[PDB]
Swiss-Prot record, chains B, C:
Its cofactor is Mn(2+). It comes from Severe acute respiratory syndrome coronavirus (SARS-CoV). Homohexamer. Plays a role in viral transcription/replication and prevents the simultaneous activation of host cell dsRNA sensors, such as MDA5/IFIH1, OAS, and PKR. Acts by degrading the 5'-polyuridines generated during replication of the poly(A) region of viral genomic and subgenomic RNAs. Catalyzes a two-step reaction in which a 2'3'-cyclic phosphate (2'3'-cP) is first generated by 2'-O transesterification, which is then hydrolyzed to a 3'-phosphate (3'-P). If not degraded, poly(U) RNA would hybridize with poly(A) RNA tails and activate host dsRNA sensors. The active site is at A235, H250, K290. It is found in: Host cytoplasm, Host perinuclear region. It comes from the Viruses. Residues 205-344 form the NendoU domain. This is Uridylate-specific endoribonuclease nsp15. The chain holds residues 6430 to 6773 of 7073 of the full protein. Residues 63-188 form the AV-Nsp11N/CoV-Nsp15M domain. Likely affects Nsp15 binding to RNA.
Length: 346, 345, 345, 346, 346
């Protein structure tokens, strides 16, 4: 049934593991996989994981190719493992999770998600596959994602985007927005009210609201004026300060895309794992201004305006907690009289 | 003649020149380094299955003249090359397992006249002394030439060739070769062929009025302008993104039309060059995707000619089109005298 | 003093900073991995020839301030840097073999004063506490500062420096440095220099009216406007793509002009940065190619000045030009009072 | 049917490849094959070859485990490829041949030794397997080994030793001495009359004739006397001279075994490959005497006597041909006025 | 001229590097060198060093095949680099020195030892090679070794043993006892008078004097009395106490050799390179006694008795400098009322 040659067969004739019978000849060398075609080798996989080459290969081939949650959502929810699939982290070119359930005999800690060894683990269940709802229903720890309503349970509307083959997108011919359900120590949990990150890169950044379009096109103070934002210090928080040797402002992703129109930015991703709050070691080409550990987060400007506009400016320093991507993010908020002085992560 | 010699040539003449000389060389991490100003600068990353030092040799001796695209040699049964290395720039490896009089570690022979060559189809380049003649004396081979060969009928090959991993139509250098094949001592007579345009999606440009009309105009305008109704272009060429699994996108230009507006991810799951390519495509705008999309880059005009010259009486048949010197099988489905679907087998 | 301490600094502060703490590490595949929520995430890929753990320490101990481009340091004969690492992002490796007070595994000393350093041209930085005084007390060394130095004549350096692998003319930060040198105890009078412009072919931009005009205007309309006939710009700068052999393109801007019409393939066969670069260039448009093209960036104005201030009576000479603090030898050919050709070495 | 996991299943259960269906879980790492046993990895193969680790594993497991000719004897007959089996070189820890016939998808040049790609190669045929003798007749280039007689064909008695699982021995419970038959370009060959290397190791050298028993026990001049050999230079050819900075003679293996009885010798086997004539960088521990490249060959002492005794002694130096292990071995024989001064391989 | 393919050619034909013209086909893979002999690859080198595989190869082949000083003697004398040769450390299968002179372009710091680069380094010179005696005279720092006597310089008789191709021995057919001369900063040095370590293995230990034979033969106090040694507690210093879980005594190699006649001793050479004083994690297989870091030093007993008997045993605990192998080794001497309590280094 299950073999390296069989996995390779699927990879070359079907583009991923499908479960078709067959064998393809394989060379393992240089932490990579090659197959013979017309007497010559053509590389079909490159191991970027800390797993043995043939194991990582089996898991990669067994990718979940349907729309799946972005790993940051899964991380923020406490997901430790997935039930009978592999959630592939495309930007680390690695599996999202340590172990496995019913996928690969080398990494499996169970063949079925409700075995004793999964008892203590928060297991991802997919409602789209037959009978995983009822598996979740009597599982100690887990997360359930569904497309439709679930009888007896209150849903938390997840984010609009999902990951489809490493492409993170809003579905149109396919459903990307899931309902989330969580279970901890045997009991149903109510997920918090959250904002959701927008999940845009700096290269392909597109605006997603009238306010965002206005943010890119208009000058600093003519924008601050239009949306009545004076006293919320967009210049020190959102915009970015490039006048000094040390870098300032530039906390939001959209504020970065603004400079990107004039000047290129280098972002060293020193810890290259996807998270709600990304820290970059940023260098500005135009000025020379640089900052290691510059925290950056992609919220809709509207969401951000709504965050900061609902804030009591009557004290020196508050600890402000905002729930984003299912995680509780801590901000320091410094206010003077009725002016916001600064706003930033901990 | 040696590692340190190959290195010297590489750093001082950009490749192997047959120059005498030697540079100190450091082998580590499946790579070649040479010392300049007392520090190591990498000059070769080995991405082959051959031992590091051997790959370096064969890479350096990579033929730097216009040579045929590797897919053409493959379709033609070319098993080996005479006294040169045809380097595969898409895999970063030699096109062939063994060599002839190139490197001791891979040579099966020193000359294509030797016995161990007799059963192999050797590529002969008429641009070098006596190789035209060697071809006449070989049992199995493919000859490429720029001009006429006396007493032999030529097959006009594709306009493109590869110069240093860049595939182009030569203006200042000749890229369109003549082709001759021999099997078991008999001159075989090569088929009438179409040639694939070998274009990338990321730099795709139209090469006729029809292709230009295809990229600019709405689906219906184009279909009507070229009276193509019933030939199922909406289901074969254009690409349907309305469902979970995506349809169409059988030609390269159909993909290029999408890319204009929104991007496609193309997983090249078996990454070697071929007439027909299969990509695991995801459509970014939509979420529609398909494992194994066969994509062939044919001039739209050539495809139009192909499909229009077909009998739509039968419910479905096998259609053989000679493309890039290979014989490709298509499945042609029909209902009531119009094309339903059309795809490689 | 721990792989884990270096690691902690990298994940938490972006690089080595001096903060106490320890992050868990896995070493595999010539790379450093760290654990975040039970899964391994790669924080370093070793592309150097040094042990993976050593290279990691040195990479983390990068100099993050604006520092000179390594070509300048090489041209100056700098063997080592005082209490810092000059990272080479082009090769992703340290610019120098060993270190001073940086890493215990490669240190040849803790301070740039002691015996081992005596015979090595040490790089000193005037921006760090009393390193100017360490320069005064050294046999061999090069000093960079921002302002004036007591009793020392400055050499005005290039406008650009490198900040975190990005070459720049700093607006919020000083990139132009003052250069001082010392050979076997004696302060040197550094020669007058042209400086190389450091532009890439991808993002090339003009920096003078003359350069703008060169990119915009037709060949002889530029030469006529700039009183340049008989200076052989047609042969030297512009680029000839009409033969199998490729001619011209001795300046970066020449390649920039062609790239406006069609792309060029550049094999950087020896991939270290330097005043004069040599590329294996293929012209996509025509098929023209040349394996060893000596090239790189001088202001077109700088080059015009150089070629014009030359006596053009002798049939051929060797000409010395001090670029990037280094004497570059050129061959200058002349027939009947007009320039024929002009090229490096 | 075939796979990496299948091969491991065979190896862990049956000790080598058997054709048993089934799969064992595997980690390829560090050019080595690991299998999971009770939670922990146990290394079951270590790639010492230039082939991909997984291809080498497959080839190894498919060892011919019955008595097979030693590799040197096969190389002297110019055997390029074995027919539907794998001869394992235990001194190299590598397959004896480059390619394969009907053994492995990665290395096969053909499936049957009856195909076109085989005509020009000398193929090892084994009478111990059905239809192979018959196959030999038709195939143009080949060497056939048998246990008994072949109707209509002249046998050639091969050496008494053969290899069983990398243990070279003379069979008592199993037959090891084969008749050899060779064939070139269509025509059935006539094999030269041969001596055979006795192929004994240094640490456990055992005498195989009364002459050898006496050689070891009796002193130098006592042996030469008892066996009538004065003027055949046994003192400077066989026994070995350790009086000079450079070691002399020791042409015969038993010569080293003799000197070993007293004090030890370091042997840098600088080319670790089986062959009729072995070359060593010997260093004598007792004296300091040493020599780069000493041609050391293990002949039955009786055989060497016969070789030198049938030798003419007229000229001052002749080049002599001696057929050992089916290979014509050249020797330089120096005669002076009546005595062999020295006699060594070219 | 010089190349990898040339070095290879030398190894497969001359046993080491000789300077012969020719080339051999080579494969570099898995930190090893292979050569093609009749269609197949035979490994001829395996890299155990921290240098690029090809570089370690250039150096290993250019081994000193002559009798050479043992590494400890050089390490104790401060030799940093040999002139125009590699001193191979066979224990580490690595070279003994960081750099090289006129040996290999990739590791040379000078083509001749007279260059500026060499002047701050103690350069090993061999009196057996043309003019290196003269080069020593004009050198700032260095160590000379000669067979015979040198004009106008006071010699120092070295150890009777030297290393011949890794094999440490007393030369009988070739000289291993060297004369030692040393310069520091232009000035000649009169070297300290010294005992030499006997450099013997436990695996094949032999006695070297009547006193040592009596040690290995006679029981404890019978021997102690016989040599008027009573009052020094060899019980705690030499013989080794095994009655405790923590291993007692056993500070001499011959002492180790005694216990080795009755029961095996496991030795972990956890810092495996050769030196005058060697530390081991020792485990006695009979009792179960164990001790990490027991300084084992192989002095001849006649030497050790001389060291201890020429000692004033008044002060309770003392520091003693003994010169062994041209190095000054510090010792701690303990004494209770005129008799010896304990004696070890540090």
């Amino acid at each position: 049934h299950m073999s390296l040659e069989n996995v390779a067969y699927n990879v070359v004739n079907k583009g991923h593991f499908d479960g078709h019978a067959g064998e393809a000849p394989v060379s393992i060398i240089n932490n990579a996989v090659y197959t013979k075609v017309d007497g010559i080798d053509v590389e079909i996989f490159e191991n970027k994981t800390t797993l043995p080459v043939n194991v990582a290969f089996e898991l990669w081939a067994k990718r979940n190719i349907k729309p799946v949650p972005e790993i940051k959502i899964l991380n923020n929810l406490g997901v430790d493992i997935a039930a009978n699939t592999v959630i592939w982290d495309y930007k680390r070119e690695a599996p999202a999770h340590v172990s496995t359930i019913g996928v690969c005999t080398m990494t499996d800690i169970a063949k079925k998600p409700t075995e004793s060894a999964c008892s203590s683990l928060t297991v991802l269940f997919d409602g789209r596959v037959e009978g995983q709802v009822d598996l979740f229903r009597n599982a100690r720890n887990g997360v359930l994602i569904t497309e439709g309503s679930v009888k007896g349970l209150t849903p938390s509307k997840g984010p609009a985007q999902a990951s489809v083959n490493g492409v993170t997108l809003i579905g149109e011919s396919v459903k990307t927005q899931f309902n989330y359900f969580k279970k901890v120590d045997g009991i149903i949990q109510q997920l918090p009210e959250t904002y959701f990150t927008q999940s845009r890169d700096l290269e392909d950044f597109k605006p997603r609201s009238q306010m965002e379009t206005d943010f890119l096109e208009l000058a600093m103070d003519e924008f601050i004026q239009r949306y009545k934002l004076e006293g919320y210090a967009f210049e020190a928080i959102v915009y970015g300060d490039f006048s000094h040797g040390q870098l300032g402002g530039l906390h939001l992703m959209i504020g970065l895309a603004k400079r990107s129109q004039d000047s290129p930015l280098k972002l060293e991703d020193f810890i290259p794992m996807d998270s709600t709050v990304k820290n970059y070691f940023i260098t500005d080409a135009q000025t020379g201004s640089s900052k290691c550990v510059c925290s950056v987060i992609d919220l809709l400007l509207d969401d951000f305006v709504e965050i900061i506009k609902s804030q009591d400016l009557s004290v020196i320093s508050k600890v402000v907690k905002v729930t984003i991507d299912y995680a509780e993010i801590s901000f320091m908020l410094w206010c003077k009289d009725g002016h916001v002085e600064t706003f930033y992560p901990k």
